[PDB]
Symmetry: none
Subunit: 110 residues, 2 copies
């Protein structure tokens, strides 16, 4: 329930920590939580996740810092319609993803 208020054109830059010894090479994803608590994946790493390589999907950039146990997420050139609830997960189909810890709320205004 951390909430970040940003303006159009700005960048959200966050770090999601995970247990290095368990999840460093696990595939990971950034999701928006839509109506009815229904997650939608907007960007994911490769399987296995590559250390450091920036993965850019649309305006989202993922960078997995294997040596520090965190996934960095950037949402660049923000738009009002990016506003919502987001989370990092460990992406492991065909099982349901493992939520890493928490969700955040992003609010983008003009």
């Amino acid at each position: 329930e951390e909430k970040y208020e940003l303006k159009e054109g700005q960048t959200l830059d966050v770090k999601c920590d995970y247990t290095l010894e368990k999840f460093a090479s696990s595939q990971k994803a950034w999701q928006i939580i839509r109506d009815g608590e229904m997650p939608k994946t907007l960007a994911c790493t490769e399987r296995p996740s590559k250390n450091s390589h920036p993965v850019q999907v649309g305006r989202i950039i993922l960078e997995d810092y294997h040596d520090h146990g965190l996934l960095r997420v950037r949402m660049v050139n923000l738009q009002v319609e990016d506003s919502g609830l987001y989370q990092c997960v460990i992406y492991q189909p065909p099982k349901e993803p493992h939520m890493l810890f928490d969700r955040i709320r992003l609010v983008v205004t003009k």
Copy 2:
């Protein structure tokens, strides 16, 4: 947990910003490293960098910026001395690794003077 990449430093004119940027020693000890400012609509801009290769401990001084690369544990120390209001901004430590994009070390620094 999920947190902002930046860490906020609120300081007064005349004081010194003194931060550490940890890195993986066995990968990056000799790599050239830099302190950059992140301005809106521009590429990150290096204000000071180590030599290539980076020397153990010897300070590099550019204006009021002091860089020190400690090879005992793999840590880049950055100071900005005699701080001015105009120093306020968003900064990062990076490791150069051409032809890849520079690799950012955590945490970014949100400086408010």
